[PDB]
Structures are given as structure tokens and as C-alpha cells.
């Protein structure tokens, strides 16, 4: 409207929102679809759901490789949103109990899930990179606000999906049975509308072309750099001052610098999967903690599961609260949060949140009687401080990480650093899956262990970020 914020981004978050909505509207019912429509084993349903989730988290690598090395972006976004819509059509077409049975349903559902994962993996990094591209490199202050609004749109979509999805699958009869066709059709229509709104702003975007087969050049440069040193019986200048400087006979300097920046950022991101895994282990253990505390609140009876909705909601309050106020206050004095102190402080806040959760668990355990009621029984409150702390940590880490990944990425490969971010998230989720089974510790000991692990991970990340040399 005024300046510094292109109209284009209007059709970059409204799309993102409309996408996240749809996604969360499909996953929420997904497991039930396996159990009560396809009538699958519990093990089979859980395994298929987890495989779909993992593929969704991992596909961002293929999405970015397609986007940056070829076809540019806004054409990978369009052509992968088309695949997303096709997968949605298949998935909603496989939930109709009229045609075929137990064979067409399974095949169509699996193909739709595969296509949905492929589309999501390539709509996720490319859309953020495109929205960032819409801003001039000079206007680095507005890009951070754009990324904050992007994250806010994602979280608003999540909250609205939680609040709206139970209405679709509640007491609806598609064809003499529960209406599972609608539960997938509505997300399909939402994704169609997201694609429509994104495409409507084609004349306004700032589509930058790709700089070539950047992935192939990067891999070849790394290969040559590692091969040159192998002077087993010789060698006078294998590669000095860096492990890439003497992969320079070929691969002109503009490519060596870009691959150097990529490798530096990857080395920085190495420890983030552990943080993602540890911070993910709070939507399950905190339910167990909530089940053991009072939830009447006098006014409204609050179930433990509903407490989950308190994390997205709080995010909606902190994204504008921080950016507009807290950060502003930090700028009053000489304090200079350089997008890497923000992430370290976020990790520290998450560690403190888990320590507070352990303290609350200890307080719960210290129960004694005076239907008998425990006098020292905690209300569902006292879970507010830990939710607030972990939510502040998540906001500060995620928004700053998006901005850092975009800002510290060479122009040729802007959308592969977003892929690296999402890949750290995916590996963290994989670690969560692997370590979920190993559960033999008390709740309080588990929480204190998670807090200590988060502290150590934050220490390692801070020590690695102190020596990080920013792109210039």
C-alpha cells in the first residue's frame, strides 16, 4: 500500500494459509480413514501414517533441487501444486465406497498420499524462497516482517484446522456410511483455491530465472575438491586455506564462493535435528502430565488433549508481540540480536521450559491427602509457564531460522537453504521416531534429561555460531 511491501506477497501467505489449512484437514482424519474405512491393522495404519509424514518432511530436497537447478521457481510451485491437487483428487476419489472395494480404495489412497507428499515437498521451500525474492536485497528489514507474517499464516491455518476439522467428520453420511469423501474433498478444494490465488498474482511477481544446474555444479565441485587432495605418494599444494580453494582450476570463483557458503551453513545446521527432536517431545509427555492434574478451572472444564490448541494460539500472540514490541525495545539500547543470538536464546528458552515442566511434574508427584480429593493437586494451570516459554523459544528459533536461511544463501541457490532447514526438521522427526520406543524412565527424570540435552545442544550450537563467518 504505502511502500516497502509489494502487493505480491498478498498472494503468498493467503496461499500458504489456504495450503496449511488443507494439509492439517487431511492428516487429522488420515489415521481414522485407515482404521474405520480401509479397516487396517493398528500397526499397518501407524506405519503408513509415519511413512507418509517422513516422506513429506524429506521431499523438500527434491523440491528445491527441481526449483533452483532447472525450471526456476513459480514454475516448480505451479507444477507441484498441480501434482498436489491431483493427489488430493485421487485421495478423495479413493474414499468413495461406490466404485471398487478394498483394492481401488487402497491403490487410490496410496497414490494420492504419494502425490500429496511430492507436492508438499516443493511447495514448502519454494514458496518461502519466492516470497523472500519479492523483496529487494536492500530492504532486509521488511523481509524479516514478511517471514514473521508467513509463520503467522502457517500457525493460523493450523489453529483453524484444529477448530474446524471435527465438524466435517462429525455425523455425516456420504453414501450410507460415514462421509470420508468430504473430509478429503474440502482440503482438496482449499488447495485448489490456494493455487488459484497464488496464480492470480502472476503478473505482479518478480520471477528470477535459475542460474544453471547449480546442484550438479555443486556436487562436481565438492567431488573435485575431495579428489584433488588424494596425493598419497606426492603433494605440494593439495588445497590450502580451505578444502575448496584448489578445486579452482575449474569451477570459477563465483561457484566456489557459493558452495563455500552452502557448506558453512550446513555445518552450522548440523546440530539442529537434535533440537527439533527434543522440542518435538512435548506434545506427548505433556499430555501424560496434564492427565494427572485438575482441569475444572471453575469456569470451563478443560480436557488434557485440548491443551494442545494452546501452543498454536500462543504463537499467534507472540509473533506480533515480539517483532513489533520486544525486538523494538531491544533496539533501544546497543543490544544487537544478529539472528544467531536469537536462535541461541530460543534454545535456552526451550531448555528452561523443559526444566519448568520437570519442576511441575515433581510438584504433581508430591501429592498427599488431607471421593477423596488431593489438597495439593495442581490445576491445569501451572502448565501455562512452560507453554509460554516453549512457545517463545519456538517462535524465536523458527522465524529467525527462516530469515537466516534466506539471507545467508547465495542467489543461485536461495531455495536449497530452505530445503536444508526442512531437512534438519525431517531428520529431527526421524530421531523422534527412533527414540520414541525407548521409554523406560520416570516423567520427571525424562524431562530433566531433555532439558540437559537441550542445554548441551544449545552450547554446541552457540560455540559453532561464534566461529561462523557470515556471507557478504
Amino acid at each position: 500500500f504505502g511502500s516497502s511491501y509489494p502487493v505480491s506477497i498478498a498472494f503468498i501467505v493467503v496461499n500458504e494459509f489456504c495450503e496449511r489449512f488443507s494439509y492439517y484437514g487431511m492428516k487429522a482424519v488420515l489415521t481414522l480413514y485407515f482404521l474405520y474405512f480401509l479397516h487396517w491393522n493398528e500397526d499397518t495404519s501407524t506405519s503408513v501414517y509415519h511413512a507418509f509424514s517422513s516422506l513429506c518432511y524429506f521431499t523438500p530436497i527434491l523440491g528445491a533441487a527441481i526449483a533452483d537447478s532447472w525450471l526456476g521457481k513459480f514454475k516448480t510451485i505451479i507444477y507441484l501444486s498441480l501434482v498436489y491437487v491431483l493427489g488430493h483428487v485421487f485421495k478423495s476419489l479413493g474414499a468413495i465406497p461406490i466404485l471398487g472395494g478394498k483394492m481401488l480404495h487402497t491403490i487410490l489412497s496410496l497414490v494420492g498420499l504419494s502425490l500429496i507428499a511430492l507436492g508438499t515437498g516443493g511447495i514448502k521451500p519454494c514458496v518461502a524462497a519466492f516470497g523472500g525474492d519479492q523483496f529487494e536485497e536492500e530492504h532486509a528489514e521488511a523481509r524479516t516482517r514478511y517471514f514473521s507474517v508467513f509463520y503467522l499464516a502457517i500457525n493460523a491455518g493450523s489453529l483453524i484446522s484444529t477448530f474446524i476439522t471435527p465438524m466435517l467428520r462429525g455425523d455425516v453420511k456420504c453414501f450410507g456410511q460415514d462421509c470420508y469423501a468430504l473430509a478429503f474433498g474440502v482440503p482438496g478444494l482449499l488447495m485448489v483455491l490456494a493455487l488459484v490465488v497464488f496464480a492470480m498474482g502472476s503478473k505482479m511477481y518478480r520471477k528470477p530465472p535459475p542460474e544453471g544446474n547449480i546442484v550438479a555444479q555443486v556436487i562436481k565441485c565438492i567431488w573435485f575438491a575431495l579428489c584433488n587432495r588424494f596425493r598419497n605418494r606426492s603433494g605440494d599444494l593439495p588445497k590450502r586455506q580451505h578444502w575448496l580453494d584448489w578445486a579452482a582450476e575449474k569451477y570459477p570463483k563465483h561457484l566456489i564462493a557459493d558452495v563455500k557458503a552452502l557448506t558453512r551453513v550446513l555445518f552450522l545446521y548440523i546440530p539442529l535435528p537434535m533440537f527439533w527432536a527434543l522440542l518435538d517431545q512435548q506434545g506427548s509427555r505433556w499430555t501424560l502430565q496434564a492427565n494427572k492434574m485438575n482441569g475444572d478451572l471453575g469456569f470451563f472444564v478443560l480436557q488434557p488433549d485440548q491443551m494442545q490448541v494452546l501452543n498454536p494460539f500462543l504463537v499467534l500472540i507472540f509473533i506480533p508481540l515480539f517483532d513489533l514490541v520486544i525486538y523494538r525495545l531491544i533496539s533501544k539500547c546497543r543490544i544487537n540480536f544478529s539472528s544467531l543470538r536469537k536462535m541461541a536464546v530460543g534454545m535456552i528458552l526451550a531448555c528452561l521450559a523443559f526444566a519448568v515442566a520437570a519442576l511441575v511434574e515433581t510438584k504433581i508427584n508430591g501429592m498427599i491427602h488431607p471421593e477423596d480429593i488431593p489438597v495439593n493437586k495442581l490445576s491445569i494451570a501451572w502448565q501455562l509457564p512452560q507453554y509460554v516459554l516453549v512457545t517463545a523459544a519456538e517462535v524465536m528459533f523458527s522465524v529467525t531460522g527462516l530469515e537466516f536461511s534466506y539471507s545467508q544463501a547465495p542467489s543461485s541457490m536461495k531455495s536449497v537453504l530452505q530445503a536444508a532447514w526442512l531437512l534438519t526438521v525431517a531428520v529431527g522427526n526421524i530421531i523422534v521416531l527412533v527414540v520414541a520406543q525407548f521409554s523406560g524412565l520416570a516423567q520427571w527424570a525424562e524431562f530433566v534429561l531433555f532439558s540437559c540435552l537441550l542445554l548441551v545442544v544449545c552450547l554446541i550450537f552457540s560455540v559453532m555460531a561464534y566461529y561462523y563467518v557470515p556471507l557478504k
Partner: nanobody, 123 residues
Framework: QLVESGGGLVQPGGSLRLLCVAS????????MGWFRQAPGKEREFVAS????????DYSDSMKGRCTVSRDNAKGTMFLQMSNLVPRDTAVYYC????????????????????WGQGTQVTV
């Protein structure tokens, strides 16, 4: 393995609590199901309870209200029908399937690999 069953005659509008006890491998490895075979009919599906009992499903008929429960300690599973009608005067079978990965429907006799003998609940 070696599943069993227990039940007998009930009043026309009464209730029963059918049993199923496993006398072998652990009860935590088995997804269980209740079927019925009315005289001169086929084996219909009555209920299914997954390992750990976290997932429970009932046939479309589910005459009255049927509830399936199971405790893995001592390996014993219950079915609690409540609002029986002169119908459903069939023989009830308990079936067990070892946990595994399959695409076969959990509401079919093919999924279950060990069918124990059945009771003769009548009305």
C-alpha cells in the same frame, strides 16, 4: 494362541459377558476379534479389538451396544452385549492374529489366523 470362549443362554432382552482367554504366547502380540455363525448362515463379524485395546471397532449391526475390552495381564478379553433381541442367536467365535504388517481388512475372517471354538449363546 489356544483361545477359548465362555457364555450361555440369556433372557430375550438381557445381556451377556463373553470371555476369551489366551493360554500361550503373550496376549500383547495378538489383535482379537469376535465373529458369529448363525445356524445355516455364514460367519459374520461382530467386533474387533487391537493390541493394547487402543482401537475398537464394531459391526454395522452391533445389536444393541457391544463393547470389547481386553487386559493383556493374564491375557483375557471380554465382550459385553447389552440389548439382545431374539435374533443373533448364533455361535460366537474368538479369533486372534499375531501383530504384523498387512493390507487385509481387520473386519474379515482372512485377517485372523487362529479361530477358537465358539459358545452357543441363545435367546
Amino acid at each position: 494362541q489356544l483361545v477359548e470362549s465362555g457364555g450361555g443362554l440369556v433372557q430375550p432382552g438381557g445381556s451377556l459377558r463373553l470371555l476369551c482367554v489366551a493360554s500361550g504366547r503373550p496376549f500383547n502380540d495378538y489383535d482379537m476379534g469376535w465373529f458369529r455363525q448363525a445356524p445355516g448362515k455364514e460367519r459374520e463379524f461382530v467386533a474387533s479389538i487391537s493390541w493394547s485395546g487402543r482401537v475398537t471397532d464394531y459391526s454395522d449391526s452391533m445389536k444393541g451396544r457391544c463393547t470389547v475390552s481386553r487386559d493383556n495381564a493374564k491375557g483375557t478379553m471380554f465382550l459385553q452385549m447389552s440389548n439382545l433381541v431374539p435374533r443373533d442367536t448364533a455361535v460366537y467365535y474368538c479369533a486372534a492374529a499375531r501383530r504384523r504388517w498387512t493390507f487385509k481388512a481387520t473386519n474379515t475372517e482372512e485377517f485372523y489366523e487362529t479361530w477358537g471354538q465358539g459358545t452357543q449363546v441363545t435367546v
